[PDB]
C-alpha cells in the first residue's frame, strides 16, 4: 500500500497555511480598504466567524460529500468528523489528515471572497444561513464534480487550482447576492500582498507533491500574475492616461484569477499569454458595470472564465503545455471547459439564490 | 548513529520562521491595536529589542541551560554560544541546529506576550532587566523540566506545544506583573491573523518531523480556533446580544491557547470539544475581572490550564486520541496535568516576582 | 544525471514565496511609512509595476543571462522564455525550475529598494527605463559574476546570500539616483518585520538544499540581526540617550544585510560580532549624512560592505566558520573579498549613472 512521503507532507502542510493566510487576513484586508470605513469592523467579525463555520462544516461533513467516494454529483457520509479515516491513511502521496486540510482551506477562501464584498448589506444571521446553504449545496458538489472523480472530472475537464470550483463559483454566487443586494488604498495593497503570496500554496499546492508539476504551477504563477499587472496597467494608461494603485492590484488578481485553472497544465509563454489577456479582459470587465465592492466579482467571474478556456487551448503540448489525454483533440478539450463553465455557473447561481431566498425568509436579508 | 531526514530539515526551518512572525510582527500588532495610541511606538520598540535580547540569550547558554543534560530543573553550560554541538549532529531527525532555533522562537513569543502588554506602564530598563530573570529562572527551568527530559517529563506530563512552557507561564509572568502595574481594531485582528498562522509552525513543528501527527497537530489546529471562535462568538451574542471583532478575534486566540498542549495527543472531535470550552471559559475569564491589555494574560491563562486538564482526557484512545502511556490510567494522567500546571504556576510567579522587585530595586519599576 | 530531492524542491519553493514576500509587500511597506503620505500610493504603484516588470524581463532573458553558460561577465540567450529547459531538469538538488523562480524572487528584491525609495523624486516612464537598463547591465553580469560562475566566482569570492549581488549592487544604484535626484511607523515595522521573516527563505534558501548549511544560515540570520538590534540600539542611546522605533527597525536591517553573505560560511560567534559591527556601522552611516529615505541606502551600502569583508575573516575554521578554500590565507580572501566589493561599485555605478541619463534625454527624470 501507498506510503506517505515526508516531503510532500512537508509541502502540503506549508501550502494550506498559506491558502489559510489567503483567507486570514489576505481577503479580509483586500476588501476592508475597499468598503466604506464605517462597515469595516462589521465585514472583519463576518468574515472570521464565516470562516470558523466554513473550517467546522468541512470536518463534520463536508470533506466527506466531497471526497468521499459516491455519485458524479456527490461523495459520502462515511467520514463524518473524519471517522474511519487512520491517522497513517495515505491520499496520493501524503497523509490523508494533510489533503483534508488543503482541501477545507479551499472552502474557507471561495467563502471569504463572497463573505467579504456581501457583509456591507446583508443581516449577519442571514450570511450564516446563505453560507451553510451554498457551502453545502454547491461548493462541495462542485468540488466533488471536479476533485472528487465526479461528472466534471470523468469527462476530462482541466481545472488545476479551481478556476471553477472557486473563482467562477464564488463569483457567481456573489453576483447573484449583488442583484438581490475605496477609503483606505495601502490596506487593499496589503491584502493584495497577502493574496499573491499564499496564492503559491493555492497554485503549486494543487499538485499534491513537490515534483516539477508543482516547479511550473510556481513559474506560471510568477510569470501571468506579472504580465496581467502589466496589461492593466497598460490599458488603463491607455484609457485613463496614467496607472493606478487599484489598478495594479486588480491586475495582479486578474492573473492570479486566470493562471488558477492552468497553472499545472501550461508553459510558460502561455502563462505569460493568459496573464495580458486576464490583465485586459479584467479590465474590460469592471469597466463595463455599466463603483462598489462588487466589481470584484466581475474580475474573479470573467478572468475565471477567461482562465478556464485558455487551460482548454495552452494545455496543448505545441504551445508548450504538458499536453491533453491521449485520444484529446484541442477542439474536444475546448467543449468540455465550456461545458464545464456552463454547469457550473448555473448550478453556482440557482443554489445562490435558493440560500438568499432561504435566508430571507427565515430572517431577512438586507441589514436592519 | 541518526542520520537528518531534510524533509524534516525543511518543515523544521520553515515552522521556526512562522513561530518568529508570531512575535514579529503578530504579537506586537496584536497589541498594538489594542493599548493606547500615545503608548504604541514605546510597546513596538520594547517588543523589538527584548525580542533581539531573547535571542542573543538563547545562543550565549539559554539552549545549553534549557536543553543540555543536567537534573530535573536545569541542563548545564556545555553548549554555550553551542560550543560542541557539530554543525552535522542530529536531533531527533533534523539537524540540531534546527532545534536550537525552533526552541528559541518558543521562547520569543512568551516573553514577546509579557513584553507587549507591560510596555505602556513599565520602565525600559526595567523590563530589560526582568527579561533577563524570567528567561534564566523560569522559561528556561520550566523548558527543561517540560521538553528537556526533567521533573514534568519524567512523570508523564503530556505538553505537545507549551500549555505550561509558553502560555501558563507567560500568563502567571503577567498577572504578577499587573498586579504590581482598543483604538486600532483592524490592526488587532491583523496581529491574530498572524498569530494564527504562525501557530501552524508552533503546533505542526512540535512534532520534531512532517510525519502523521504533525498532520494530526495541524488539523486539531483548525478545527479547535474554529470551535473556539464559534464558543466565544456564541456566548457573546447570548450576554451582549451581537457579537464584536474583538469577541471573534478573542476566540481565536482562545482555542489556539486551549489547543497548544493537546495537539498532537488528541482525536478531531477532542480538538472541537476543547475549543468550544475554551471560547466559553476564555470569555468567562476576561468577563471575571471584575478593560485593559492585561486581560490578555486572563485568556492565556484561564485556556492553557482548560487544555493542559483536557489534554489528560482527550488524549485516551477511548475519546479518539493517540493513547495514554503504558500502564497509565486517565485518572493518573489527570492528577499528573494538574500537578504540573501548580508547579508552573508558582515557579513562574515566585520568578517573576523576584525579577520585578529585582527591577524595581535597581532601577525603579514604574515608568518615570 | 542528477535526480532531484523533493525535500529540496519543498525547501526552495516555500523559500522562493517567503523572498518574494520581501518585496509584496515587504519592502512597500518599508518605505510605505517612511515617505511623505501624499506620495504612497504612488510609490506603492510603482514598486507593483516595476516588480511585475522584472518577473517578465527575469523569464524572457533575465535567467538565461545572468545563469547560462557564457563568460565571465554574461551568460547567454540560450534559454530564452526558459526555452530548452526540459521541465523535469535538475539543477544542484532541485528542478531548474525552481532555481530561475528562486533567483528572479532576488532581481526582484533587489529592484524593489531601489525603487521604494526614489518613486518620490522619479518620473514613472523615467524608472521604468531605468530599470530596464540596470536589471539587463548590472544586476545580470554581476549576479552572473558572482553566482553564474563568472568572474569573481572563478577567483573565489564568498558571498552566499548576495552583499555585493543584491546589496551593494542597489546601495550604488540608489545612491546615483540620490546625487542625480517618517509617516507612520507602525508602518515602518511592519514592512521591516515582514523583510526580517522573509529574509529566512532567502539566506537559508540560498544553500539550495535543507541540509546543515541551510541550517547554520538561518541560526546566523537570527542571531546577527539580534545583535544588530542592540548595537544599533545601544549607540542610540548613547549618542541619543534613548532608543527609538526606528532605530530597531534600522538595527534590524543592518544586520540582515551585514550577515547576507556571510550567513552560510560563519559561526554563531562570528554572526554575532558581524551583527553588533553592522549595527554600529549603520548607525555611524546614516548620522554620517551629513532625513530622507535615501539614507537606506547608506545603511544597505554600509553594512554590505562590512559584511563582505568580514566574510573574507569569519570563515576561517580557526574562528568558527566553515573554513576557506584549499590553499586560501585569510590574507588572500580578504583581498578577493575587497576586489569583489570594488568591481561591484564601479559595476553599479557607472551602469546606474547610463540608466538615470538615458531615461532623462528620452523623457525627463524628474517628476513632472
Known amino acids: 500500500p501507498a506510503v506517505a512521503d515526508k516531503a510532500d507532507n512537508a509541502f502540503m502542510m506549508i501550502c494550506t497555511a498559506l491558502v489559510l493566510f489567503m483567507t486570514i487576513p489576505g481577503i479580509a484586508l483586500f476588501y476592508g480598504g475597499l468598503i466604506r470605513g464605517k462597515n469595516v469592523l462589521s465585514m472583519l467579525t463576518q468574515v472570521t466567524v464565516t470562516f470558523a463555520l466554513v473550517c467546522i462544516l468541512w470536518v463534520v461533513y463536508g470533506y466527506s460529500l466531497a471526497f468521499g467516494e459516491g455519485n458524479n454529483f456527490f461523495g459520502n457520509i462515511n467520514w463524518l468528523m473524519l471517522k474511519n479515516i487512520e491517522l497513517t491513511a495515505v491520499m496520493g502521496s501524503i497523509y490523508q489528515y494533510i489533503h483534508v486540510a488543503f482541501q477545507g482551506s479551499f472552502a474557507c477562501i471561495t467563502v471569504g471572497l463572497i463573505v467579504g464584498a456581501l457583509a456591507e448589506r446583508i443581516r449577519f444571521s442571514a450570511v450564516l444561513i446563505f453560507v451553510v446553504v451554498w457551502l453545502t449545496l454547491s461548493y462541495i458538489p462542485i468540488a466533488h464534480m471536479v476533485w472528487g472523480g465526479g461528472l466534471l472530472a470523468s469527462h476530462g475537464a482541466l481545472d488545476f487550482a479551481g478556476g471553477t470550483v472557486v473563482e467562477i463559483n464564488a463569483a457567481i454566487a456573489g453576483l447573484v447576492g449583488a442583484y438581490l443586494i475605496p477609503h483606505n488604498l495601502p490596506m487593499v495593497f496589503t491584502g493584495t500582498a497577502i493574496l499573491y503570496i499564499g496564492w503559491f500554496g493555492f497554485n503549486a499546492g494543487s499538485a499534491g507533491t513537490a515534483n ?20 492593466w496597467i497598460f490599458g488603463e494608461w491607455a484609457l485613463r492616461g496614467k496607472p493606478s494603485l487599484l489598478g495594479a492590484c486588480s491586475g495582479a488578481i486578474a492573473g492570479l484569477v486566470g493562471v488558477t485553472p492552468a497553472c499545472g497544465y501550461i508553459g510558460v509563454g502561455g502563462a505569460l499569454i493568459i496573464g495580458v489577456v486576464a490583465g485586459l479582459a479584467g479590465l474590460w470587465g469592471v469597466t463595463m458595470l455599466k463603483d462598489d465592492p462588487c466589481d ?47 454547469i457550473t455557473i448555473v448550478w453556482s447561481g440557482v443554489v445562490a439564490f435558493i440560500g438568499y431566498k432561504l435566508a430571507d425568509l427565515t430572517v431577512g436579508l438586507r441589514v436592519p
Not at 516539477?212 to 496589461?231: C, H, S, Y
Not at 505545441?318 to 468540455?336: N, P, Y
Open 212 to 231: 516539477e508539476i508543482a516547479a511550473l504551477a510556481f513559474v506560471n504563477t510568477v510569470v501571468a500574475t506579472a504580465a496581467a499587472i502589466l496589461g
Open 296 to 342: 470584484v466579482f466581475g474580475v474573479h467571474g470573467v478572468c475565471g472564465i477567461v482562465g478556464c478556456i485558455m487551460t482548454g487551448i495552452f494545455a496543448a503540448s505545441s504551445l508548450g503545455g504538458v499536453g491533453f489525454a491521449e485520444g484529446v483533440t484541442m477542439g474536444h478539450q475546448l467543449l468540455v471547459q465550456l461545458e464545464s463553465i456552463a
